[PDB]
Amino acid sequence: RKRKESYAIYIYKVLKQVHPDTGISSKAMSIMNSFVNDIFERIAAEASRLAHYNKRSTITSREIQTAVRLLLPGELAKHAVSEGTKAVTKYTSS
Amino acid sequence: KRKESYAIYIYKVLKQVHPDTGISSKAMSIMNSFVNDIFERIAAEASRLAHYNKRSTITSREIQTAVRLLLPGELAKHAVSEGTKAVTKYTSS
Amino acid sequence: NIQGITKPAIRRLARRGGVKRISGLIYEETRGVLKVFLENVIRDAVTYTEHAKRKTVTAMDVVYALKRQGRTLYGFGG
Amino acid sequence: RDNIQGITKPAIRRLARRGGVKRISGLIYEETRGVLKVFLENVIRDAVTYTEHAKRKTVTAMDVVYALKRQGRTLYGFGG
Amino acid sequence: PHRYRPGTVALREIRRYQKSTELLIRKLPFQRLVREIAQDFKTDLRFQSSAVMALQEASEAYLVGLFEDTNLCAIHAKRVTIMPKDIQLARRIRGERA
Amino acid sequence: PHRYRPGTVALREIRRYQKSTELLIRKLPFQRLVREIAQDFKTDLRFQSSAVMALQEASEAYLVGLFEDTNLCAIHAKRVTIMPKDIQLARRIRGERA
Amino acid sequence: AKSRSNRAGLQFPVGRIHRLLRKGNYAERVGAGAPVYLAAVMEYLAAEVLELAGNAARDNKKTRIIPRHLQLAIRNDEELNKLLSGVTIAQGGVLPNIQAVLLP
Amino acid sequence: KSRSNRAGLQFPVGRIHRLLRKGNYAERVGAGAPVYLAAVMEYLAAEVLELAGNAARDNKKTRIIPRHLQLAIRNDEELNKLLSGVTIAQGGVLPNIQAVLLPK
Amino acid sequence: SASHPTYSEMIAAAIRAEKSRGGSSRQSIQKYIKSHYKVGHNADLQIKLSIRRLLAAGVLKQTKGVGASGSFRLAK
DNA sequence: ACTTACATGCACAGGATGTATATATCTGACACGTGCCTGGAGACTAGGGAGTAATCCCCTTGGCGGTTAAAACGCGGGGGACAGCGCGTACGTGCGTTTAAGCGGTGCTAGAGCTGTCTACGACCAATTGAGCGGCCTCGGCACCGGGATTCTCCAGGGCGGCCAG
DNA sequence: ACTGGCCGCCCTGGAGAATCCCGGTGCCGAGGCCGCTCAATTGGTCGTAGACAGCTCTAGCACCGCTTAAACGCACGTACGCGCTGTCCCCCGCGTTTTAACCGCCAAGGGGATTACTCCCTAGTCTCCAGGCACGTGTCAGATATATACATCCTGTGCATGTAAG
């Protein structure tokens, strides 16, 4: 048998928070799925090198944020850092 | 304080291809950056190659395939020859 | 059979590119540029196929090839 | 605030000469200052981003090298 | 008879295909082209249906964008007709000559 | 008096700088340009001398290459004088339009 | 018990991301905040595209997002267009653009 | 006996092997991987050092400078392609004046 | 609707008023006529048209170029 | 004096066509049900990478002073950019003809995918030392600076040939 | 008519000014030595994932028949692209003049590369559910077709300045 995990269900959840009455085609979900995995690989790859470059063996929030600052253009980066910081803070409070 | 580099190895190679020719430090730096660059380039791809096929070992095969992908035309053909050669000679001593 | 990629097929693509007028010499040149493009991508694709020890080129092989050349494609996985 | 004018017309002309340019419109010079400015803004930004990561106040050569590489403009002869 | 003017139908086509998103090259002829080019790498290659589609999708997307640049080059030379010399300039700035 | 002809001294300059490798921008003025631009990211920034030099090399290499491409756009349009329009076309195909 | 996703107030899987990092050959150790921060950034960009894609779908009297809308959303957005300047969206098509000099 | 000598290489097989292990590329590294890689690195290094040496001699010099590297690479079709996106410091450019600008 | 003699008379007047080898071009004549006479917005078209017809008659003779883009002189 | 003809602009008729509009209907893609398997917790341990204050001291910033290469301003006249005109003609639109793409059903299997083996290859800790890095002298290829010598650009000063101007 | 003058053209030496090339000479970085670390190498333990043989079956080529839709061939007429021409002024080249970059210099201190001490974060493991997958069924957003209201393109007619014919 075969089991292929995905980001499908999470992308759909996010869609409902942003546009509750809108749906999405299979091909579009695939594209969305490729995009998230892409961004994941990109950011993590850069963070990986950042850790290597600065002779650290741990990827922390610090590297990810800096990786984000490097890869995302202008305003995108700013809000991405805002969202990143927000989430990590709330998670630490528990 | 000690920083390692390919400095000493590049000179030995230079002396093999042109024994009466030297190289300036700035030129040597450029050469050192180039070898280090190529190292990082080849290894990243081999890493990805090993990943795409769900294997956790970097073998001579990933290196070879990486070369075929990164290096243009005839450069790859001669690179693959040398890589093959090297591995053979090493495995027989 | 490379003559198969014809004028009316080429001319639609140009239209989509926003082109209004096309020199007759453009059509053969386009066939040539396209072959080159395809040669490079197919080359890397097959290279991936052989590393996996397969005789069938999968879609991922094409995707990985396109990514290697900075032309990532969405809607086929990857 | 007006130090962007320090990249003078003569200086801009020589570069064009090395680029193989023979004749230059007077409007080229200000536009050239602008492109270079944009170029520097993009590179320095990434360079400083590397600096802050290392928790340093000083931008090192490697920071610039990494910055340039990040932007698809690899540079040989300074490290890496 | 009704005959319009040269360029009228042309412009209509531009507006048309820029609005739609279907592949503009004939599937089957292109699929044969892929295997032929593939012959020069490995004998008796097999292809996933999606692999051929991914190639065609990527191929048309490449050419379409190239025509956009070719157009700007033609216009730059005070023309409305793209010519071989227009493609050459665009590709040269882009890289990978010929 | 001796005055040559327009363009003659220019070609001589072209050949001259294509033969050499020294930096063509004034060292000190460029350095000031860097720190001013850096201000808008972090205040009281310090620089390594070698850092500023690495920037000038890249910067001049970028511009020199841009002028080569720019020059080709000009010639394409049947001119021998580069113009703002030429730089805009080169950069557009090059990316980093804005 | 509280899901780590919920603790960070995220829709994206902090759990999945955290694992993918460990088995991804990036570093010997992964900080507790790292997966949360990354997941947060991934959800934002997804939401960003969706808000614009949603609009694009709406602008054609359609409620279901198709590749064409994803295309329109990205290419009409300055910040997204630059972030995805080297990506090609299948069945996405091209943005309507006719140069002024060709118009009658 | 050094590992370099067993493969008949100048480049450090041992150093490359270490760099691979501590470089976050894979859980394990094959025995032939460093050998294959060092040979390829050595070849490319030799290829450029070969062309550069010839270039310096042509300008009546015995010591290699950045300029000779730039000339060597950009004149070699294969190396040029390989280094199409690299900029060599203090390397300058190759003399190329467009035909129409010349007088007659 | 201002006063002005014919274009034939004006062009001939403009050419003969200008002592010159290559007689006169189209541009030369046009600026002479504009400052020495009350002429309308379509001077250029009428000048263009008049040279076309005077050449064919052989009233105007050609010097450089071919057609309304050139330099021309009067016949003897 | 009136009428006719270009050649321009411009209004607006025009049907003729291609666009987008609404309403009725059908088709099947997607969002949501169910059992079922695997990762994500949850709780806790121990090893050590990373945080800490504090140590040299390397290297950036800072000031000065004289020399002068280099940027600035002005100033003519030429070589270019640009607009216009006439000409040839490739490119477009369109219809009638031709070819093979596209769509359907189906047989037959090469090959991708999966499971289950267990041999062999690579991380792992430990021990020995010699490979390779950080100073330290010289000295020679090269940078610096002098005088001829070769190459190149050019603008006069002719001599040949065109055609008003008279 | 004819002459005479001005104005073109092609080339044809030398004056003016750079460039290559030869020469002697000051010198700072390259090449080599050699001190001392710590990384590489030999030697064997394990533990696993990669090599490998076996399997099922999803999926690829492959043939056949079928309509039509897409290609294609052909021929008109237009407007677009190249060439030539003529004018204006923007760009060049040059010399003076004024800026300030550059160099060589000494002086103060931020903060960079490195230290040990040790806290506190992280990997590693066994153990229960449930979140997320594959797996289904039914509503419905989208696609289609025919009617038709709206928007677009294109000729053909009238009309101030002109120029001839009577």
Description:
Chain A: Belongs to the histone H2B family. Chain A: One of its GO terms (molecular function) is DNA binding. Chain A: Keywords: Chromosome, DNA-binding, Glycoprotein, Isopeptide bond, Methylation, Nucleosome core, Nucleus, Ubl conjugation. Chain A: It is found in: Nucleus; Chromosome. Chain A: One of its GO terms (cellular component) is nucleus. Chain A has 94 residues and is mainly alpha-helical. Chain A has one domain (1-94): Orthogonal Bundle (Histone, subunit A), CATH 1.10.20. In chain A, 73% of the residues lie in helices and 4% in strands. Chain A contains four helices and two strands. The radius of gyration of chain A is 16 Å and the shape is globular. Chain E has 98 residues and is mostly helical. Chain E is 65% helix and 4% strand. With 104 residues, chain G is mainly alpha-helical. Chain G has helices at 4-7, 14-22, 33-58, 67-75, 78-83, and strands spanning 29-30, 64-65, 87-89. Chain G has one domain (1-104): Histone, subunit A. With 76 residues, chain I is of the alpha+beta class. Chain I has one domain (1-76): Orthogonal Bundle (Arc Repressor Mutant, subunit A). In chain I, a hairpin with a 4-residue loop joins strand 2 and strand 3 (70-74). In chain I, helix 2 (26-36) packs across helix 3. Classes of the chains: A mainly alpha (94), C mainly alpha (78), E mainly alpha (98), G mainly alpha (104), I alpha+beta (76). Chains in contact: A-C, A-D, A-G, B-C, B-D, B-H, C-E, C-G, D-F, D-H, E-F, E-G, F-H, G-H. At the D-H interface, strand 3 of D face strand 3 of H. The structure holds a DNA duplex (166 and 166 nucleotides).
List the helices and strands and how they pair.
The complex is a heterononamer, with 2 copies of chain A, 2 copies of chain C, 2 copies of chain E (98 residues), 2 copies of chain G (104 residues) and 1 copy of chain I (76 residues).
Chain A: H1 8-18, E1 23-24, H2 26-53, E2 58-59, H3 61-71, H4 74-92
Chain E: H1 8-19, H2 27-39, E1 46-47, H3 49-76, E2 81-82, H4 84-94
Helix pairs in contact in E: 2-3, 3-4
Chain I: H1 7-16, E1 24-25, H2 26-36, H3 43-57, E2 60-65, E3 70-74
Antiparallel strand pairs in I: 1-3, 2-3
The structure holds a DNA duplex (166 and 166 nucleotides).
From the structure above, extract its key features.
heterononamer; C: 78 residues; mainly alpha; Histone, subunit A; 3 helices; E: 98 residues; 4 helices; 2 strands; 65% helix; DNA-binding; structural constituent of chromatin (chain A); Histone H2B (chain A)
State the separation between the terminal residues of chain A, measured CA to CA.
39 Å
State the order of secondary-structure elements of chain A, H for helix, E for strand: HEHEHH
Q: How many beta-strand elements of chain A?
A: 2
- Quickly give the structural class of chain G: mainly alpha
Tally of DSSP helical segments of chain A: 4
What is shown here, in short?
The complex is a heterononamer, with two copies of chain A, two copies of chain C, two copies of chain E (98 residues), two copies of chain G (104 residues) and one copy of chain I (76 residues). With 94 residues, chain A is mainly α. Helices cover 73% and strands 4% of the residues of chain A.
